[PDB]
């Protein structure tokens, strides 16, 4: 406990300056209330929620009796679905899939983390409910939308978007985007969903965080981002928490791409498996900078103190109780 | 008042104290202030280019094309020259401006270049974050929207700044994509007026072919305020009512002039504004309904506190 | 004019190794009396509202009024109009033999009369004629009649052509092969429109498709404008640099307002003359 | 499967024969493939070789990476000291022309079917580039959906990177126009390509865009080692693509290319 909490305020001293002002922003904006977490599998991951790889295996099998001799490429995860829902019927499918995510699943403590980064939105392509639980604990609502049908009705001002449906309906293969087919058809079939993600992107400060950096969906949004004016966006942040540190040149390609990248194996030492450690290390990076645990010397608390009261110098006089909400 | 228009009434009312109405504001707002009408821009450029007005009358693809050919000609000095020459005026806020930041719309969506909504919002103390060009989409100070679809000249008056030719036309969904988005969205979580628009309009056509893409009832019809001199045709309305549109005719509730835009403008933005402290009580059942709709919430609870209910009766 | 010199001779040119084609629009259908589609918009905008439209119609109310009736009369209704309106039995003007003269490699047209039909038939030229979906593949020869906007050979219905505001939207989701076709086409060949107006629909939506393409990769269509009024300066170099070469019929000849069938004459033959 | 070698006849004496040449009947004559450029890449981006095996998405990304990071100049270096090589046309290349297509329609960025072609005497028209099209001077074609190197060993004449392929439609207006038209117009016969390649599944995905009936269901020619699995056959079936199987008509050795890309080609040609 107070041993993490020593090695994470040195691990913030060390930290690059390029790292420090991603940091800062993504503080910047919590505090704003613009910011907005582009939740992936990984966090899903971390609460032991089943893998996609687990239900192609399960396709692959009814297919053919055998499972793979070899690892499915980027395809394989979309087509064998798409070949089981052709071949075999419709019904095979979504039964395979209400005996693979019909579970329960505790929340993570990464859920918690993102939680108390207060976002404005959540975006995930995860289908579970772990993040309505864990939005539905802390104390704040979210509008969850999975169904075009909930855009044009959300009862509160922020929302939880699930641009790849969930099983809320029921664990249906029509409500979900998995084959390849839905992934082709995603633009005609999600018109609404896809428009809300977009808007939400270029309107807020986005993290991302569950994701590869050669995700599908991660580098789909890039595609889009390429298509709009230089400099009329916000980068979008990156959370890397892949074992092994970001090589420079993806590094920089990346970044030439639109993303402001926080790799967490450049900041702290873990194990291969350790990917928990890695989410932590950033969440908590992220955390205890908002809770300014990293504030050190002098002339950094008068920063912090003038920015809180500045803006009281046009008032004549401010009430005790006042300042306590100033000060939070 | 017929029972569907009273149904628009209520529907339009109860967003705007919801917080969830949006008004989509044309053309015909700003030309009650007597703002330069685009097809004069027309005129000057054909007597540009051509050396005489035209002998019959614009279509609705010379409209784009002749200032179009004029910029290809003359080039982009001249369109501008013209563009600051017309449209550098002053002009007032007709009181259509005033009532519709009155009904407290959420977002103002325009395809209007000029200030007036700009000049109503400033006058009435109503601040909106403008949004005219694509990095004011990111760089929005707060959540309520100024969208001027079509850029606006606060930049300076160039035709890069606005959507006049057919060329930016064309180009609109790779020039503003931001901004097209954003609109899309606001259509698709708010209740939409379109007001000063005359059911034939360009971009009432792309939002209706925009429209006919999404899935079946996953979006509420947007309300559409009719200020035409004559009456729609009943199969004018059927046809739009099922292309998507709850339209509010003026000439059906009123009597007026040809030339009585004003009237006709007022009509229908009065009675929007004058409904929202109605109740559209008046049989004995609408009773029945208003006192459950106000109370059934309240049957969760056992008891309630008698000096609570005027809270709940406002 | 100098200009005019060289737009005779590639026209010319490309039509003695086969590599001509001709984009045939409504105006030549117009010069054999075939029933225009503004009467047909008045009958569906009479049957609409019980009254003529006593006004101008834009190019926008072409595509709505059908579009109109068709939503709230239905499809019965619209067919029946589309029967005794087109079902008529119409010669062919001198200029579709003009056309055929010039011995095209292929025919595209927008017209979904059998006009051109006719006239390939009566001089014994063999045309594949492709107008549906299914006609792409199963296309005996290689020299096509490409009528890309259907006809009423399979019958005088409404989803067999494209006339309304839906088949215009949804063009390319139900014509795909013949969109593609119509384009290879225009790509590999030497393309003369006749028929149309700098302002038609069509010759825009090509030009849409040209400027799409890398420069200097294609050739530039030819234009035949017969329109009474002599080209604005202005008006040309516009389209001309928009990919046109444009072969005013007016500044050629002088002629009468009201007389179409020589100013388009007046170019067809000079075309035949030169070969 | 006698049905199929029916129609390739039918369809070869009428002229109508188009033949869609993949990489794989590239490899059969010993041309550098890709994935050992993906490698130079590789190792001149990272300094060593991957340990995994490449992705779909990776054949495509290290190469943009290498070209954004790296430059144009280094990206067309690499690709002249790998593909400025000579070499011979196996005889599958005159297997494919001994039926007398229309026309060949390549993603290979070779000359190794311009070759093929020259040596035989048959003179197609060569088309890599946008301005080839309107200056082709024949009725058949040899397309090169992909580009070649004519030009030059640059990477602007060739669709090798994930951006090539994201912007293929609109730098390839009409070479992608001609190539849907001739598949339209032709019955198609696919060599040299797996089941799983992006450019097969592509045109997969606009034949499903076209309306029942109304094309040519072409014909695929399978040479992987394996035969094909049933279930995997009937969804490729339906998807519009009758394969023929030399995994199945004959017993092959797993390397044995050669003798599978003959066994189908010879039966073609002995059929006719």
């Given at each position: 406990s107070k041993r993490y909490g020593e090695k994470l305020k040195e691990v913030f001293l060390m930290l690059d300056n390029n790292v420090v002002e991603c940091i800062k922003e993504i503080t910047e904006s919590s505090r704003n209330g613009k910011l907005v977490f582009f939740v992936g599998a990984g966090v899903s991951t971390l609460s032991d929620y089943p893998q996609w790889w687990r239900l192609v295996d399960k396709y692959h099998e009814e297919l053919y009796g055998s499972p793979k001799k070899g690892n499915y490429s980027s395809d394989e995860y979309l087509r064998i679905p798409q070949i089981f829902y052709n071949v075999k019927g419709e019904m095979a499918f979504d039964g395979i899939l209400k005996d693979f995510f019909q579970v329960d699943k505790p929340t993570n403590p990464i859920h918690d983390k993102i939680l108390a980064m207060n976002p404005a939105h959540v975006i995930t392509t995860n289908y579970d409910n772990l993040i309505d639980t864990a939005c539905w604990k802390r104390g704040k609502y979210f509008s969850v939308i999975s169904a075009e049908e909930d855009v044009a009705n959300?009862?509160?001002?922020?929302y939880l978007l699930k641009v790849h449906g969930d099983?809320?309906?029921?664990?249906?293969?029509?409500?979900?985007?998995?084959?390849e087919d839905d992934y082709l058809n995603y633009d005609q079939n999600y018109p609404l969903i896809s428009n809300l993600m977009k808007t939400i992107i270029a309107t807020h400060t986005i993290v991302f965080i569950?994701?590869?950096?050669?995700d599908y969906n991660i580098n789909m949004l890039l595609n889009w981002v390429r298509k709009?004016?230089?400099?009329s966006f916000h980068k979008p942040f990156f959370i890397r928490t892949d074992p092994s540190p970001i090589e420079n040149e993806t590094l920089i390609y990346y970044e030439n791409k639109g993303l402001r990248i926080i790799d967490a194996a450049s900041l702290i030492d873990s194990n291969e498996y350790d990917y928990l450690e890695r989410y932590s290390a950033v969440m908590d990076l992220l955390i205890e900078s908002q809770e300014n645990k990293?504030?050190?010397?002098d002339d950094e608390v008068i920063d912090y103190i003038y920015g809180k009261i500045?803006?009281?110098?046009?008032?004549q006089y401010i009430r005790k109780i006042d300042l306590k909400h100033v000060f939070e």
């Open positions: 959300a009862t509160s001002s922020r099983f809320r309906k029921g664990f249906k293969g029509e409500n979900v985007v998995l084959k569950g994701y590869g950096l050669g709009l004016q230089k400099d990293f504030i050190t010397k500045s803006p009281l110098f046009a008032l």
